[model samples]
Target chain A: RMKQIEDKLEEILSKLYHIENELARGKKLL
Target chain B: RMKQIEDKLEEILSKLYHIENELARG
Candidate 1:
């Protein structure tokens, strides 16, 4: 159970998504 | 307005700089 108020998870998840997409979609696409 | 508390933005760019350099150098 996460903080169900203020859309907290959304903030954290958004940051993770940013990193994942950039690093995963790095120069060498394999 | 020359100073901010904690100055986390610097750390943020520090990390982004890492990936930015890696991607560019690749």
Candidate 2:
């Protein structure tokens, strides 16, 4: 779990997911 | 110039630029 480290990692992972979703949406619009 | 193909390519490039811009914003 790494408690403290896990918290920070989760935040970064969340942002990364959002970025991937945005890219996917843009590609689909094409 | 690649006329015909250039047109389509530019459109895709434009969209790509927008995507890059959006990602930069976030």
Candidate 3:
């Protein structure tokens, strides 16, 4: 189960990071 | 974790896709 937990954490983190980029515009900063 | 996410969305689709996948995988 530890592996699953770690995977979920990594998945969530990666998703968060990915989303941060999405809301960002080409010439806009937020 | 890395492997699945690495593949789960390796293409880096729009945030829309992310949300869609989450909903689909649900």
The best candidate in terms of TM-score: 2
For residue A11, what is the lDDT in candidate 3? 66
Query: Candidate 3: which docking quality band?
Result: incorrect
Roughly what TM-score does model 1 have, to 2 decimal places? 0.38
Model 3 off-target regions past 4 Å?
Answer: A26-30, B1-26
User: Sort by lDDT, best first: what order?
Assistant: 2, 3, 1
Q: How do all models score by TM-score?
A: 0.38, 0.47, 0.46
Tens-digit lDDT track of model 2 for B1-26 = 34544455545555655666878786
Question: Candidate 3, overall lDDT?
Answer: 0.57
lDDT of 1 by residue, A1-30 (tens): 323522443554457558846775775685
DockQ list for all candidates: 0.09, 0.04, 0.08
lDDT of each: 0.55, 0.61, 0.57
lDDT of 1 by residue, B1-26 (tens): 12332243455556667667666666
- iRMS of candidate 1, one decimal? 5.0
lDDT tens digits, residues A1-30, model 3? 457556656666777776566545423843
- DockQ for candidate 2, please give it: 0.04
Q: How well is candidate 3 docked (DockQ)?
A: 0.08
